């Protein structure tokens, strides 16, 4: 037995804390590094000597995706030669080494390592459609930081942590643990909230210290190094005296893993088996659909939030309170809602809560934005305007999708990898979480920009986003529903 109120409030045995608290620390370190790196790259590329920030979009398009595929191929290669632990260390140490060499060797030696300006005539030797490659190669080290800062969350959190969790957690145990790991994300959000503001405060020396980004960057980067080394120590501890405890991983199944399976294929062989598996393309669709929908339902919503609040002081107050309650709602949903929905209803319900909600409360949102004029005769007789009503309804879909990401979406999705063979639990996971996720947060910007030129104005593409969302949610719901048939079947094969 487990209990009556505890089987619903805290479904963790007291002995199986030694497996989950180290994973909480791992998630904490990863998310802390990710938040610090994001907020230091978006703050470091504003203040290069001269216009060293204009070459952000050239990076965003020409390096971010391409370097994501390069990392993905290199990871696929190293998965065949290195062990699981060796691969984890060999992916993590380059990040920490770059974060150590940046403030010591790389950033201070800007004017010496950036193109000896001689790569200035090289601008006008190449066709006038690759001026960015000159700007990218001119802001060379800053380019290496934006890629390694964007990739960190895609690499460490999605591929490395979850790929480690999905290798060391059973499905029934996943239903109880995976929802909880975003509490580490929220606690790391508090830690980063203190750390980043500490760095910004210490950015004060103007005269005796002329370099503003010397000391602050060195301390932020050393903080990321300390967090990454604590990450690696957590990995070592959980591999040395967690996967070795006989309580879990019953004795004879232990040496089935230190003597276990491993990705054994070739680069084109592996990326032709993954491209012709209906399972992986469905996971790719979920991540692509989630990437665009959450971005589209957020740019559509953070356009009414700008019409309702045309002054940043209260927009910061609403988004200061929204960012505070998306932490409270996403500590209760993680502790209480997420693990319970997946255990009393099933896998499918957990994967369909957030798209159905985004659908139902997105239908309401778009019906109050498209039909704004012929709705302020009824809504106006209830004490509110349809703009405020779309703000609140759109906040619910942005507080039941951001508070559902780690709890039900990232739980059910990374649970889906568990019954898989190694070639997609490791190498397909790279494509889904590093490459097939880049098209998510970039495909929502392309759809926005591609429709900001077909409609011209942001207010005219709302009827076109709605049909786009209704199709992506359609392909999301069918992908989630068709995936459930494969998951519940492939899971059944694991009881051989």
């Amino acid at each position, epitope marked *: 037995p487990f209990g009556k109120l505890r089987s619903f409030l805290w479904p963790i045995h007291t002995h199986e804390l030694k497996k989950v608290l180290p994973m909480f620390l791992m998630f904490f370190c990863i998310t802390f590094n990710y938040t610090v790196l994001r907020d230091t790259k978006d703050t470091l590329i504003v203040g290069a000597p001269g216009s060293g920030a204009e070459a952000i979009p050239f990076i965003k398009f020409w390096l971010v995706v391409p370097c994501a595929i390069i990392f993905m191929l290199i990871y696929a290669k190293l998965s065949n030669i290195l062990s699981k632990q060796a691969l984890f260390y060999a992916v993590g140490t380059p990040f920490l080494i770059f974060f150590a060499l940046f403030p010591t060797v790389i950033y201070p030696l800007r004017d010496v390592l950036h193109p000896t300006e001689f790569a200035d005539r090289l601008q006008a030797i190449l066709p006038p459609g690759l001026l960015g490659l000159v700007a990218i190669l001119r802001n060379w080290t800053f380019a290496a930081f934006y890629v390694l800062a964007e990739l960190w969350g895609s690499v460490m959190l999605s591929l490395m942590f979850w790929g480690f969790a999905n290798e060391i957690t059973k499905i029934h145990e996943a239903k109880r643990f995976y929802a909880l790991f975003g509490i580490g994300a929220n606690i790391s959000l508090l830690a980063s909230g203190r750390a980043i503001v500490w760095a910004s405060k210490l950015r004060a020396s103007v005269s005796e210290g002329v370099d503003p980004w010397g000391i602050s960057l060195r301390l932020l980067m050393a903080m990321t190094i300390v967090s990454g080394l604590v990450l690696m120590a957590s990995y070592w501890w959980i591999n040395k005296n967690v996967l070795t405890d006989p309580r879990f991983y019953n004795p004879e199944e232990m040496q089935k893993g230190k003597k276990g399976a491993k990705p054994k294929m070739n680069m084109k062989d592996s990326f032709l088996y993954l491209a012709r598996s209906p399972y992986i393309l469905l996971l790719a669709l979920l991540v692509i659909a989630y990437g665009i929908c959450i971005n589209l339902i957020e740019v559509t919503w953070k356009s009414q939030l700008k019409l309702q609040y045309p002054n940043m002081n209260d927009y910061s107050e609403f988004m200061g309170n929204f960012s505070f309650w998306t932490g409270v709602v996403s500590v209760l949903i993680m502790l209480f809602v997420g693990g319970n929905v997946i255990r009393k209803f099933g896998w499918l319900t957990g994967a369909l809560v957030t798209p159905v909600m985004v659908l139902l409360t997105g239908i309401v949102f778009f019906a109050l934005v498209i039909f704004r004029n*012929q709705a*302020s005769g009824l809504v*106006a*007789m*209830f*004490g509110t*305007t349809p703009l405020m009503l779309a703000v609140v309804v759109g906040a619910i879909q942005n507080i039941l999708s951001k508070s559902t990401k780690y709890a039900l979406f990232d739980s059910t999705k990374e649970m889906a990898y568990i019954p898989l063979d190694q070639e997609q639990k490791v190498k397909g996971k790279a494509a889904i979480d590093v490459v097939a996720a880049r098209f998510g947060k970039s495909g929502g910007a392309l759809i926005q920009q591609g429709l900001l030129v077909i409609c011209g104005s942001i207010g005219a593409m709302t009827p076109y986003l709605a049909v786009i969302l209704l199709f992506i949610i359609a392909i999301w719901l069918v992908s989630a529903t068709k995936l459930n048939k494969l998951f519940l079947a492939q899971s059944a094969l694991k009881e051989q």
Partner: nanobody
Amino acid sequence: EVQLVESGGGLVQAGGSLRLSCAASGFTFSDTYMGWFRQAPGKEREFVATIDYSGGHTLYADSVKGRFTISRDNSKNTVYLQMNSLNPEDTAVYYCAARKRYHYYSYWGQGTQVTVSS
């Protein structure tokens, strides 16, 4: 039965004023949600003012903010509407409105003609 007798209509110069009225009978005015719409000939109907169950919440349309002030008195049961600084596009049939405490539709009114001249 639930008739809403309007009043106050007439011709007034630009920058003038006229004050509507909506006699309410057939329900509990103290717990009935009031308002005022308007429908110019040719264009659809838009809401112009709104007053809550207890006179506290006053929601207006962005085209009549500051100029029009809705006010209701439960004793002398009427959802008044004080219009000031009238501009020519306020020419319409200013419908009264009424909603019960848990109903989702509105008992409309006959309609008062407010032609603001130029």
